[PDB]
Each structure stands twice: as C-alpha cells, then as structure tokens.
Amino acid sequence: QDSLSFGFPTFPSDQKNLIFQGDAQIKNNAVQLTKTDSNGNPVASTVGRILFSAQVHLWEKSSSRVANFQSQFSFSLKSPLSNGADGIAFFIAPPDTTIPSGSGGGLLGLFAPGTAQNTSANQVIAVEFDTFYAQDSNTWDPNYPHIGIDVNSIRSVKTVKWDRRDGQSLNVLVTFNPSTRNLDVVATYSDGTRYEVSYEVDVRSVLPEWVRVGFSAASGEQYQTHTLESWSFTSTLLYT
Amino acid sequence: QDSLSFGFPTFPSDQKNLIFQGDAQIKNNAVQLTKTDSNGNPVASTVGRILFSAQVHLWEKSSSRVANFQSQFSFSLKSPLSNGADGIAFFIAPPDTTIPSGSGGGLLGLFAPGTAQNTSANQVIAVEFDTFYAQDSNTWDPNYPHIGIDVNSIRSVKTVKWDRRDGQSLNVLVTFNPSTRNLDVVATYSDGTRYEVSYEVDVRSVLPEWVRVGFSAASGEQYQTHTLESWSFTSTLLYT
Ligand SMILES: CC(=O)N[C@H]1[C@H](O[C@H]2[C@@H](O)[C@H](O)[C@@H](CO)O[C@@H]2O)O[C@H](CO)[C@@H](O)[C@@H]1O
Ligand SMILES: CC(=O)N[C@H]1[C@H](O[C@H]2[C@@H](O)[C@H](O)[C@@H](CO)O[C@@H]2O)O[C@H](CO)[C@@H](O)[C@@H]1O
Ligand SMILES: [Ca+2]
Numbered sequence: 001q002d003s004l005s006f007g008f009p010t011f012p013s014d015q016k017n018l019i020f021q022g023d024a025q026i027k028n029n030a031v032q033l034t035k036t037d038s039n040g041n042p043v044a045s046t047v048g049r050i051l052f053s054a055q056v057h058l059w060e061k062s063s064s065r066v067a068n069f070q071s072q073f074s075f076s077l078k079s080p081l082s083n084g085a086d087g088i089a090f091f092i093a094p095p096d097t098t099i100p101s102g103s104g105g106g107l108l109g110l111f112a113p114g115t116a117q118n119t120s121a122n123q124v125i126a127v128e129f130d131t132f133y134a135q136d137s138n139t140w141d142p143n144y145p146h147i148g149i150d151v152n153s154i155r156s157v158k159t160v161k162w163d164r165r166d167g168q169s170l171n172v173l174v175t176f177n178p179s180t181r182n183l184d185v186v187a188t189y190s191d192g193t194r195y196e197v198s199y200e201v202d203v204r205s206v207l208p209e210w211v212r213v214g215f216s217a218a219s220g221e222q223y224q225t226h227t228l229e230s231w232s233f234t235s236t237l238l239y240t
Numbered sequence: 241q242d243s244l245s246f247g248f249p250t251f252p253s254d255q256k257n258l259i260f261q262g263d264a265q266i267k268n269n270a271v272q273l274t275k276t277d278s279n280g281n282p283v284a285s286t287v288g289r290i291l292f293s294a295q296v297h298l299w300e301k302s303s304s305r306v307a308n309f310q311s312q313f314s315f316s317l318k319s320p321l322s323n324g325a326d327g328i329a330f331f332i333a334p335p336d337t338t339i340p341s342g343s344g345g346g347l348l349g350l351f352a353p354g355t356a357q358n359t360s361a362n363q364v365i366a367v368e369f370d371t372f373y374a375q376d377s378n379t380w381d382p383n384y385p386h387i388g389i390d391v392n393s394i395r396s397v398k399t400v401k402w403d404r405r406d407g408q409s410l411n412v413l414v415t416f417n418p419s420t421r422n423l424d425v426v427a428t429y430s431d432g433t434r435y436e437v438s439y440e441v442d443v444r445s446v447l448p449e450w451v452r453v454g455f456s457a458a459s460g461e462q463y464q465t466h467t468l469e470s471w472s473f474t475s476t477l478l479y480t
C-alpha cells in the first residue's frame with residue numbers, strides 16, 4: 001504494498017533497481033539521461049530514460065483508494081549552445097513502457113510521432129521542463145521555455161513560463177493529492193526563484209492501477225546534457 | 241537507493257513486487273507460505289518463500305556505510321496436530337537466492353542438508369520461529385519451541401524459549417542498529433506476553449552489499465499453516 005518509498009541522494013555506479021533505456025547511464029554519481037562524448041560534452045540525436053524497477057500501486061479499484069504521492073528531484077542542464085534542447089520529464093506510465101520509435105527531439109522520449117497529440121492513443125502523465133520551442137518542429141509548444149503538465153499528449157494541458165540556466169541545479173517537488181485531485185509542481189533555483197504550475201486530474205481515468213515512475217530526456221538537432229542529480233519518491237494509498 | 245521502505249498492511253491477490261518460490265501463494269488477503277488443500281487445511285511435505293523484488297542496499301564498501309533496518313510483521317500458525325511443524329523465518333540473503341534442494345522440514349526452506357551446519361557454505365541471516373524440536377531429527381535444536389537467530393547455519397547462534405499458540409497472531413519487530421551492530425528481536429502476543437532476543441553481528445562479514453529480504457516456511461512429516469498477515473520494512477544507509 002500500500003506504501004512505497006525510496007531515496008537516491010546521489011547515484012553511485014552500482015545500481016540494482018533501475019531500468020535503463022536508450023542512452024541513459026551513470027557517470028560521476030549522477031544519471032546522464034542523454035549521450036555525452038568521450039570529453040563529456042552533449043551530442044545530437046540521443047534519447048534516454050530510467051524507471052525504478054518496483055511497480056507503484058497508484059490506485060486500487062476493489063477499495064476505491066487512490067495514492068497520494070510526492071516526487072522530489074534535482075537536475076541540471078549544460079550546453080555549449082545558447083539554445084540547448086530538448087528537455088527532461090518526470091513521468092508515470094504503465095509498467096511495460098519502452099522508448100517509442102522516433103520519439104527523440106521535442107517528443108522527449110515519451111511519444112511516437114504519429115500519435116503524439118492523440119490523447120486516446122497514449123497512457124502517460126508527465127511533468128516536462130522544455131527548453132526548445134521553435135514553431136517549425138515543436139508546433140504544439142508556447143513560444144518560450146516552459147514547465148508543462150502533459151496528460152496523454154505532448155501538447156501540455158497547462159504550462160508556466162520558465163527560465164533555463166546553464167549549469168544550475170533546479171530543485172523540483174511534484175505532489176499529487178487524491179482528496180483534491182491536484183497535481184502540483186513547484187520548482188526552485190538556489191537563489192529562491194520559484195515556478196509553480198498545477199492541474200486537476202483524475203489519475204484513475206488515465207493510468208492503470210499499477211505503474212512505473214521515472215525520467216526521460218532527449219536531444220534532436222540541438223543538444224545539452226540532462227543530468228539527474230538526486231531523486232526521492234513516496235506513495236501511499238488513501239481513502240478520501 | 242540509500243533508503244527504501246514498503247508496507248503491506250494486508251496482502252490482496254493482485255501482487256506485482258513479490259517473488260513467490262515453492263508453494264507460497266496469496267489466499268484470503270494473507271500469504272500462505274506452505275501448501276493447504278481445498279479446505280484450507282495444512283498438508284505435509286511443502287516449502288514456500290516470498291521475497292520483495294527490489295534489492296536492498298545493506299552496506300556500501302566505497303563509503304563505509306551500513307544500513308539501519310527495521311522489519312515489522314505478524315503471522316499465525318494453525319494445525320489440528322499436537323506437534324505442528326516446522327516453522328517460519330524472516331531472512332536476508334543474496335538476491336539470487338532460491339529454495340535449496342532438500343531444504344524442507346526442519347531446514348525451513350533455507351538450508352541444504354549437506355551444508356546446513358557449515359557456516360562457510362552459506363550466506364543467510366534469519367530469525368526463526370521454530371515449533372518442531374524432536375531430538376531425533378532436529379538434532380541441532382534445544383528441546384522446546386523457540387525463537388532463534390540463525391547466521392549461516394540452522395543451528396542458531398542463540399535461542400530463547402517461545403510458546404506456540406494455535407491460531408493466534410504474533411507481532412514481531414526485528415531491528416538492526418549498525419552503530420552497536422545489535423540485531424534485536426521483540427515478539428508479542430495480543431495479551432501482552434513478550435519475547436526478546438538480541439545478538440551482535442557485523443552484517444558486512446556475512447552478507448553481500450545488496451540483498452533481498454523475505455520469509456520462508458516448511459513442513460516435513462508434521463505440518464501446520466504458516467500465514468504471513470502483514471509486513472512493513474524500512475532500511476536506510478548510515479555513516480558508521
Ligand atoms: C536529428 C533528430 O534527432 N531529430 C529528431 C527530431 O528533432 C527535431 C525537433 O523535434 C527538435 O526539437 C529539434 C531540436 O533538437 O531538432 C529537430 O528539429 O524530432 C523528431 C520527432 O518530432 C524525431 O523523430 C527525430 O529523431
Ligand atoms: C517428508 C519430508 O518432507 N521430509 C523432510 C524432512 O523432514 C523431517 C524433519 O526435518 C522435520 O522436522 C519433521 C517434522 O516435519 O519431519 C521429518 O522428520 O526434513 C528433510 C531435511 O532434514 C527434508 O529433506 C525432507 O524433505
Ligand atoms: Ca519543446
């Protein structure tokens with residue numbers, strides 16, 4: 001299970017409970033979601049994701065319970081370019097999820113090209129930190145960097161303007177309260193600059209009872225590293 | 241991960257994070273470790289174990305840390321016989337652990353006959369609730385039902401007298417404090433009767449850095465049900 005929690009203050013190379021997909025790997029005690037060269041610089045055309053191995057019991061039909069969960073994490077982005085891409089996302093998906101074919105670039109390793117905006121063809125809730133929004137390729141994006149809540153589509157149901165700061169860690173808290181059905185996101189830089197975005201969603205009508213949680217990141221023609229530095233998660237089924 | 245916790249107030253049929261070995265199965269919201277017939281009556285010659293799927297980081301060589309862990313659980317045993325057998329154990333072992341050939345009966349599904357008392361041939365720490373002690377077959381046991389702490393051998397490094405009570409739940413708390421290296425066990429029945437036993441052990445010299453935790457039970461010629469009713473576990477790496 002009814003409750004599960006785990007904490008990664010850092011990421012040592014000897015991991016046993018993480019599923020690595022695509023180009024994701026541990027380097028310097030952090031997870032590098034997207035590929036880097038020998039010298040450690042970001043490269044184009046790369047997708048990577050990680051999922052915790054134990055499944056999370058998000059809701060239980062037999063008892064009408066739904067989980068209250070909280071995910072706290074920190075990440076930093078670095079790039080030689082003034083317009084690094086494409087972004088990183090915390091996501092919740094069915095357990096057998098895998099990287100969809102062609103999901104690189106602005107699709108963030110989460111959606112397939114042909115169905116990226118079809119809410120009926122996907123099962124995913126994600127919180128994206130999107131740094132690239134050129135309207136010729138990312139047609140669904142507002143025209144500025146942003147944090148968005150994605151419910152079955154790369155076109156966010158709610159966004160807030162955000163500032164990308166090269167090399168600075170962003171601390172994020174994502175919480176879901178089954179009582180109010182509010183998924184709240186609070187992100188802050190060390191100087192106190194804060195961003196907040198929230199959305200009401202009934203997770204029961206979007207995702208199965210059991211899910212896996214993790215992170216995804218991608219770079220298409222433009223690039224930057226997507227470094228996940230720490231991550232804590234706790235979930236508890238509650239009756240509301 | 242450095243920290244992991246999970247809680248099973250009950251065990252609904254739909255499980256995803258448990259590894260079932262032998263005859264173990266969920267019935268009536270509890271784990272029946274040993275086989276029961278259609279009526280729910282115990283049968284002879286059965287062994288069953290469950291393990292939590294995620295691996296636990298017990299200690300870390302690179303940082304000299306060792307985990308503080310606590311395992312709380314309740315179980316009940318029932319048998320129409322006057323000498324129900326053989327017992328249930330909470331155990332910690334390497335991740336790839338499987339039921340040893342011939343480990344039924346008094347070996348509790350934990351040891352192989354040929355090496356059951358050879359401390360160099362095993363890697364297991366277990367807390368046993370042993371109800372069968374006939375000196376002619378269970379030659380390593382004291383002559384009364386007992387709680388025992390087993391370190392790489394079925395011959396307990398320590399035992400205390402215990403009373404088997406048919407159909408009554410026993411609540412147990414097992415804790416390990418890495419600073420004192422004490423493994424403490426406290427068990428109570430609902431009328432307040434209490435049993436306590438402690439042992440000092442450096443888990444680093446017995447077990448590998450990553451392990452799995454779970455329960456094992458067996459019945460040989462004599463039998464009884466071994467029903468695990470609830471279980472919560474928490475582990476966190478500490479500087480020591
Ligand atoms: C070379 C490459 O990886 N192309 C992927 C492409 O990337 C697009 C766009 O989506 C990105 O936002 C920008 C900046 O990195 O680069 C390209 O213009 O996205 C496709 C999905 O729409 C992927 O299938 C391609 O792999
Ligand atoms: C029939 C059977 O399962 N025999 C197992 C045997 O069981 C012994 C003893 O260990 C038990 O304590 C008692 C009470 O149940 O029954 C028999 O006397 O134990 C062997 C290991 O010592 C197993 O290999 C046998 O499978
Ligand atoms: Ca984008």
Ligand SMILES: [Ca+2]
Nearest residue numbers: 346370372378
């Ligand atoms: Ca015995």
Ligand SMILES: [Mn+2]
Nearest residue numbers: 130141148156
């Ligand atoms: Mn976007």
Ligand SMILES: [Mn+2]
Nearest residue numbers: 370381388396
């Ligand atoms: Mn014994």
